[PDB]
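Format notes (please read before filing issues)

Several people have asked whether sequences and structure tokens are stored in separate files. They are not. Every record keeps both together, in the order shown below: the sequence lines, then the token lines. Line labels are part of the format and must not be stripped during preprocessing.
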Amino acid sequence: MGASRLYTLVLVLQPQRVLLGMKKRGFGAGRWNGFGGKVQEGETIEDGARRELQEESGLTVDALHKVGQIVFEFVGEPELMDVHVFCTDSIQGTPVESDEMRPCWFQLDQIPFKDMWPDDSYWFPLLLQKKKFHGYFKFQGQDTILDYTLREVDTV
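Then the structure lines:
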């Protein structure tokens, strides 16, 4: 028995350029977005975002940078989705764009949040600002949003 779909979100955004993953054919063929991943049955969000990160663009990180935590509430369903945000810089592998994925290195002032998701623009502004925040967005199914909340954090 369990609940709350805890996933991850890794965006290799540097103070000069950003790396977004685009699909070639399937779920987002022609759209860029962070590399998210679900926390295995007993793994850490940093491990899920890391282990799933290396799989998205063959780029492995030695240590990402947690910035914010986004949440997704499903209308009509009790379950939810806890997505953590992580921005790396120190990678290992190569942009081994596969037949399913295709990353693109661009500028930190030209990242297209519209070609990713309806929440990117909500957690991007703080990322670029180097600030920590947490937002809760209610979805009408998976792509439509009906509620969005943003709370900045820093202390404990």
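For reference, the curators noted about this record: Residues 1-156 form a domain with the Nucleoside Triphosphate Pyrophosphohydrolase fold (CATH 3.90.79.10). Helices lie at 45-57, 120-129.
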